[PDB]
From a paper:
The higBA2 TA system from [name] consists of an mRNAse toxin HigB2 and its antitoxin inhibitor [name]. Antitoxin [name] forms a tight complex with HigB2 through its N-terminal disordered region (IDR), which folds upon binding. Here we show that in addition to the primary function of [name] IDR to act as a toxin inhibitor, the IDR also contributes to specific and high-affinity recognition of the higBA2 operator to regulate its transcription. The [name] folded domain confers specificity towards a single inverted repeat operator sequence, while the IDR enhances its affinity.
Author numbering:
A (entry chain A), B (entry chain B): 37 to 104
The structure:
Amino acid sequence: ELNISPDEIVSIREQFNMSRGVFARLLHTSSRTLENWEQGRSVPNGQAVTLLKLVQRHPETLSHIAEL
Amino acid sequence: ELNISPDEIVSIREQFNMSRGVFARLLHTSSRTLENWEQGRSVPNGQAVTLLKLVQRHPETLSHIAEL
DNA sequence: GTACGCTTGGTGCGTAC
DNA sequence: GTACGCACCAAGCGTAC
């Protein structure tokens, strides 16, 4: 039952010192959609929650995504 | 933009020799939603596509999801 | 398995500030 | 960055087979 708050989403990419645009691009995610999540206008879908928590635990995941 | 065909999704799972229910569980995904993807009813969302492709390239990603 | 109908709300903008 | 409106359709069923 994974979930993630708007503040947690922001704190992930601020740990990496990445802007919203940089982080969204490296996550193969629309920056406007990421804006929705960080502002709290909608709940991210289940796989987006999994992906965010994966990247947080294993930041090299961003490199694996770039290798797809 | 990453794409994945319904047959591609099934073969990822059949690599692990897992039923639709088992694979959806380890991927923190509704088994009925996965049914939509494998039948071609719907296009998986962008983060779902990324997750599936990570798993296809790195099977250990499945175990990493369980650590979450 | 397969397939189709349904409600809900996320997606991904456009726009203004 | 903030916040709101909008169309489109994915999500996650319930059901029939």
